[PDB]
Each structure stands twice: as structure tokens, then as C-alpha cells.
DNA sequence: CGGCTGTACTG
DNA sequence: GCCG
DNA sequence: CAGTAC
């Protein structure tokens, strides 16, 4: 819907990042709901009440609304560290987080030449430093659409049943994409192995593949660009699974990241783990509460399946933004 | 006040 | 940050 | 293990 509250959210998001990149994850968490709930909220809060009647705004967070609403700004916003927009950009470096990006600032630097030529930098970061500009692009859905394509048919190339979909914001229908995570699979349950690396080495090799972040056994992120003058280089991830969790592959990789977590804290009330592998039961737990047994595994062929065995109504994948 | 998702590659 |  | 990321 509308954000009936935009007003509002802007001021907050910017709070909410100064605190993300300084690395107070917890209280940048508690904003990030907030906004959340503020963006889909049936009308422009009015009252301090209303704003605490719901969930994942508290008195804090209420104060701040109001005086939003009230003086149109946040006093908040004028006392923000002067090193946050460095740290924005430092953090902003792929394989850099904000341990790096302080570390970075108290060294001195201060701009991404900075960085490029006296920091020192990891394999990935190096990497992402070179598609700085390039990562931070969100793409059009119709190219993630030809990145699917393009990895479906190297991936067809090796067996006619794999199966490959594109997942994360691609699957949640946006018109915009900041990568493409495709999962692929295989009906049979057992052709998906021994084809990962061979599949990489083929994308490698037709040169759509052009960097590689993280290499795993079943999970890959990478750079790719797709053939064509002046295309511009999209951040990839890859994952093989077993057929038996397709639907909690799916389930994970469609996200988003919000929706995901919220779904596992339910999972864990309800007495159950959801994880990108399986929807399981009570994992077992000794006096101190120390992990000693995995819970049993509760087939779920379909996404479907998942959220009913929560007591969830089946929700589209255009409305899992959190 | 303590939890806030669960899991995985890199160095 | 918020929540139980 | 610390850091980073999905
Ligand atoms: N449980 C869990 N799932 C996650 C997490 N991060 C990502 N996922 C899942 C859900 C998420 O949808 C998927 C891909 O993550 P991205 O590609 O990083 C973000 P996307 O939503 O795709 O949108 P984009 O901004 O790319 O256009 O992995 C996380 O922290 N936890
Ligand atoms: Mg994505
Ligand atoms: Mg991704
Ligand atoms: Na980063």
C-alpha cells in the first residue's frame, strides 16, 4: 500500500543507518521494525498513544514520531557523528563491515582512493572495491530476468531437469534487484550433486562469471555481467540443494531477510526451528539449555506446507517484505 | 534484563 | 531500539 | 575465533 507516514520514516531510516553503520545492530534492529511498521500503517500517526498501540514502537520511539510530526524534525538527526557518511562508505564495500570501516577511519582514511590505494585490502574487498559504483546500482527486474535465463541454461547444458528460479526481491516482484540469488534443484532428489563446480567453471569460462566472493560446497556468491556493450557488473549467488528442502530453500532465499527472521521467531515459539534446510521440531536442550540433539525433520514438499505447520496463512511472495 | 534467526565461508 |  | 554476508 501507501506509507501514509513517510514524513516520519525518512527521518527515522537516517537515524537508523547512522546507528547501523557505527555497529549498534541491535538498536539499528529496533528501528528497522519500527519502520517497518510506521511505512504500513492505515493512516499518519496522530497521537503518542496511538503510536505506542503498535507493535514494535515503544515510548522512545513514540516520543520521536511525535516530535516529527509535530516540529517536521528530528533534534536527534543534528548530533549524528561527523564520521557516519565515511563509514556509510566504507561499509558500503562489499566483504567490509563495520568493524573494517572503523578501523579504516581511525587509520585516517577517508575516501574510496584512499582506500584503493594505501588500505589494505581482502581478496573480496579488493573485489568490491573495483564494482563499488556498479554494486550500489539496484538493476532493472528485466536484467536479473536474463541473469536467471543465463544461469538456467548453462545449468540445463549438464541435465534438462535441474531446476533453477530466481529468488530474494526477484521472486517478491520488485522492478529493481540488487542482486539475483537463483537456487537450483533437481526433481529426483539426487542429480543436483556433482554439478556445482562444473557449472561454475562453465559461466566461468563463457566469461559471464568474473569474480568470485565465496566459493562453497553448495552455496556461491560471485560477479557476473552479462554479454553486451556497456553492461555493468551485478553481484550473483548461487545455491544447490537437495530436493527434499526445495521448499525451505525457496522458503529462505525468497526472503526478505525481515520476513525470515520473523518467521523463525514464531517457528521457535511454536516449539520448532526454521532454517533454509528444514522445518524441524524442539531441538533437545540439557539443564544449561546447550544444544545435544537435533529436533526431527517435518516434511514440507511446499511453502505452503511451511506455513501451515506454523498456523500461518500462505502468504504470496510479493507480500514477504518483512 | 536478556533475546533479538540460523547457518556458512574466509583468514 | 522493542518485547515478553 | 572475529568479521562479514545470505
Ligand atoms: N534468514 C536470513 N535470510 C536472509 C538473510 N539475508 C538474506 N536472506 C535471504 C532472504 C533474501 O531474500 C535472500 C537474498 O538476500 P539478499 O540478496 O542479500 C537481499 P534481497 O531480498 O534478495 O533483495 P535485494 O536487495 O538483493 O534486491 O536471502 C539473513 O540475514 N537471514
Ligand atoms: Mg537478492
Ligand atoms: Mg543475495
Ligand atoms: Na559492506
Not at 538456467?152 to 517478491?172: D, E, H, T, W
Amino acid at each position: 500500500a501507501t506509507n501514509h507516514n513517510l514524513h516520519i520514516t525518512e527521518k527515522l531510516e537516517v537515524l537508523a543507518k547512522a546507528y547501523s553503520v557505527q555497529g549498534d545492530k541491535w538498536r539499528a534492529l529496533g528501528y528497522a521494525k519500527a519502520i517497518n511498521a510506521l511505512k504500513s500503517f492505515h493512516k499518519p500517526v496522530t497521537s503518542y498513544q496511538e503510536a505506542c498501540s503498535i507493535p514494535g514502537i515503544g515510548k522512545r520511539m513514540a516520543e520521536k514520531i511525535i516530535e516529527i510530526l509535530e516540529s517536521g524534525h528530528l533534534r536527534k538527526l543534528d548530533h549524528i557523528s561527523e564520521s557516519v557518511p565515511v563509514l556509510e562508505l566504507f561499509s558500503n564495500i562489499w566483504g567490509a563491515g563495520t568493524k573494517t570501516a572503523q578501523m579504516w577511519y581511525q587509520q585516517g582514511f577517508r575516501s574510496l582512493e584512499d582506500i584503493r590505494s594505501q588500505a589494505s585490502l581482502t581478496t573480496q574487498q579488493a573485489i568490491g572495491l573495483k564494482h563499488y559504483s556498479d554494486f550500489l546500482e539496484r538493476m532493472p527486474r528485466e536484467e536479473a530476468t536474463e541473469i536467471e535465463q543465463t544461469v538456467q541454461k548453462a545449468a540445463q547444458a549438464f541435465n534438462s531437469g535441474l531446476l533453477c528460479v530466481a529468488c530474494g526481491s526477484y521472486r517478491r516482484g520488485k522492478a529493481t534487484c540488487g542482486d539475483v540469488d537463483v537456487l537450483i534443484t533437481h526433481p529426483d532428489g539426487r542429480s543436483h550433486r556433482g554439478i556445482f563446480s562444473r557449472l561454475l567453471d562453465s559461466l566461468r569460462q563463457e566469461g559471464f562469471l568474473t569474480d568470485d566472493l565465496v566459493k562453497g560446497e553448495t552455496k556461491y556468491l560471485g560477479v557476473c555481467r552479462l554479454p553486451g556493450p556497456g553492461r555493468r557488473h551485478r553481484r550473483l549467488d548461487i545455491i544447490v540443494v537437495p530436493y527434499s528442502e526445495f521448499a525451505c530453500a525457496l522458503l529462505y532465499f525468497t526472503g526478505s531477510a525481515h520476513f525470515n527472521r520473523s518467521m523463525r521467531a514464531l517457528a521457535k515459539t511454536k516449539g520448532m526451528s526454521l532454517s533454509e534446510h528444514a522445518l524441524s521440531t524442539a531441538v533437545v536442550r540439557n539443564t544449561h539449555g546447550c544444544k545435544v540433539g537435533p529436533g526431527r525433520v517435518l516434511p514440507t514438499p511446499t511453502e505452503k506446507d511451511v506455513f501451515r505447520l506454523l498456523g500461518l496463512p500462505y502468504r504470496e511472495p510479493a507480500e514477504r517484505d518483512w
